[PDB]
From a paper:
Recent findings revealed that [name] functions as a checkpoint mechanism that fine-tunes the rate of mitophagy by disrupting the recycling of the ULK complex during autophagosome formation. The phosphorylation of the [name] FIR motif enhances its binding affinity for [name], enabling [name] to compete with other autophagy receptors, such as CCPG1 or Optineurin. Here, we determined several crystal structures of the [name] claw domain in complex with phosphorylated [name] FIR peptides and elucidated the specific recognition of different phosphorylated [name] by [name] claw domain. Each [name] claw domain within the dimer features a five-stranded antiparallel β-sheet and a short α-helix.
Author numbering:
A (entry chain A): 1492 to 1542, 1551 to 1591
B (entry chain B): 102 to 109
Write the structure that this text describes.
């Protein structure tokens, strides 16, 4: 089957494993990238997540590259950290 | 929110 989980270079339509990252207080994509791929806040309701379920399988819809502009932020990353936000819907 | 982070 084409249903295998992507691990890098995420593209629209990829199947991704979305996991709770307690240290960063957010859902992230499982990845071998050193960069954080956070789940976009808009995607939580349709994945039956809440702002917790440990993992869900999603389909990538959109990817956005971001940078922390303050030292205290919701992603628990230092000032200047770059990261992605990914919109995804349920794989099923 | 836009204070904390931005798209780059």
């Amino acid at each position: 089957h084409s249903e295998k989980i992507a691990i890098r270079d995420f593209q629209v339509g990829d199947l991704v494993l979305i996991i709770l990252d307690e240290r960063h207080d957010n859902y992230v994509l499982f990845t071998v990238s050193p960069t954080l791929y956070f789940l976009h806040s808009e995607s939580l309701p349709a994945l039956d997540l809440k702002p917790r379920r440990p993992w869900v399988l999603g389909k990538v819809m959109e990817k956005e590259y971001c940078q922390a502009k303050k030292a205290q932020n919701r992603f628990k990353v230092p000032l200047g950290t770059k990261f992605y936000r990914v919109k995804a819907v349920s794989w099923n | 929110t836009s204070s904390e982070f931005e798209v780059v």
